[PDB]
Design a binder for this molecule. Structure first.
Ligand SMILES: COc1ccc(C2=NN(C3CCN(c4nc(N)nc5ccccc45)CC3)C(=O)[C@@H]3CC=CC[C@H]23)cc1OC
Ligand SMILES: [Mg+2]
Ligand SMILES: [Zn+2]
Length: 333
């Protein structure tokens, strides 16, 4: 399929990104994009550098050549939407790295499992089209029909897995080619399982199952590793509120635009439009983020940190302080 080539290849290798430390919890992807004419080659380099620097691809007989083909193969599959673009999955990959190596979550998993997670971040939203699963079902869209007929409500997540598998059948872009037997099976199994678990419809059930496993010393060990990978991918996804406020705010600008556009399309089609998707209300960013923090993200991070993931306490602290900063935008309005 397609083939990347040196033209695109080198176009990434000749980015050096001197101003930053990709390993830092305060790494700023917004700066990186802004700091060149080629934001797409910069993002790729950040992924490339993160993966190579972990020394995980080498360990699992993944050469640099195949690695970069893989990244680049994913990039093509991402579109140009406000939020669910290739910058979001590069973000997720970089954030997951910080949770593994600064939050010491590496200790709870094998190297293969850390390698799979870093990879899975990049395939997790392949060919996302700005539109949530709901839209596909309410518009009786062909992908919603296929999902509905096929027995799986996770319209996009199955889509992303399909594309991810595609990319890896080609061995010049197959970052698991060096795995054999049980390891290769696990890599695909867990990668798919993780991606499917990013469907926010399943958020409660996946959080309650990870916690019940974490509190049980007799939990099946393979099942705990798996749920931990699922929880970490989920964490990367909702990690925007754990960043430095200014980075957080810009993430929230991007999603708020993306939601607005779906809601524009939901008006045209004539289908139901939720409050959140409606440009008609200015819809105070502050109150949106405060609600997202109180109902989804603060309880999530606090609970997994306490159960198990004590190294990630900083996520709970930054949420707490990002919240207080939104309350001070309210108090001074
Ligand atoms: C930067 O800031 C955001 C980034 C991503 C998302 C994402 N949001 N969501 C939904 C998650 C659940 N929601 C709310 N639920 C419940 N119980 N209460 C709420 C109260 C107030 C607002 C929302 C909710 C709806 C949105 C996705 O599904 C995206 C796709 C995948 C993962 C997360 C994304 C939201 C952001 O800020 C609002
Ligand atoms: Mg997704
Ligand atoms: Zn995502």
């Amino acid at each position: 399929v397609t083939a990347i080539t040196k033209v695109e290849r080198e176009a990434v290798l000749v980015c050096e990104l001197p101003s930053f430390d990709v390993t830092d919890v305060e790494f700023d992807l917004f700066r990186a994009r802004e700091s060149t004419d080629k934001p797409l080659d910069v993002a790729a380099a950040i992924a490339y550098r993160l993966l190579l620097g972990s020394g995980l691809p080498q360990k699992f007989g993944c050469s640099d050549e195949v690695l970069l083909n893989f990244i680049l193969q994913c990039r093509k599959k991402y579109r140009n939407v406000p939020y669910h673009n290739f910058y979001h999955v590069v973000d997720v990959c970089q954030t997951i790295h910080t949770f593994l190596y600064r939050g010491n979550v590496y200790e709870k998993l094998t190297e293969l499992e850390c390698f799979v997670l870093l990879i899975t971040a990049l395939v997790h939203d392949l060919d996302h089209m700005g539109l949530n699963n709901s839209f596909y079902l309410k518009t009786e869209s062909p992908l919603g029909i296929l999902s509905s007929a096929s027995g799986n409500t996770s319209v996009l997540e199955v889509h992303h897995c399909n594309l991810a598998v595609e990319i890896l059948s080609d061995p010049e872009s197959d970052v698991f080619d060096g795995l054999e037997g049980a390891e290769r099976t696990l890599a695909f199994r867990s990668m798919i399982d993780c991606v499917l678990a990013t469907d926010m419809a399943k958020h409660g059930s996946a959080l309650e199952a990870f916690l019940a496993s974490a509190a049980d010393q007799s939990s099946d060990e393979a099942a705990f590793h798996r749920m931990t990978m699922e929880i970490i991918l989920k964490a990367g996804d909702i990690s925007n509120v754990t960043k430095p406020f200014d980075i957080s705010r810009q993430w929230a600008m991007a999603v708020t635009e993306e939601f607005y556009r779906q809601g524009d399309m939901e008006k045209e089609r004539g289908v139901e439009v939720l409050p959140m998707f409606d440009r008609s209300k200015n819809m105070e960013l502050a109150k949106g983020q405060i609600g997202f923090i109180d109902f989804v993200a603060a309880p999530f991070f606090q609970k997994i940190v306490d159960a198990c993931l004590q190294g990630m306490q900083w996520t709970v602290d930054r949420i707490k302080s990002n919240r207080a900063q939104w309350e001070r935008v309210l108090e001074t309005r």
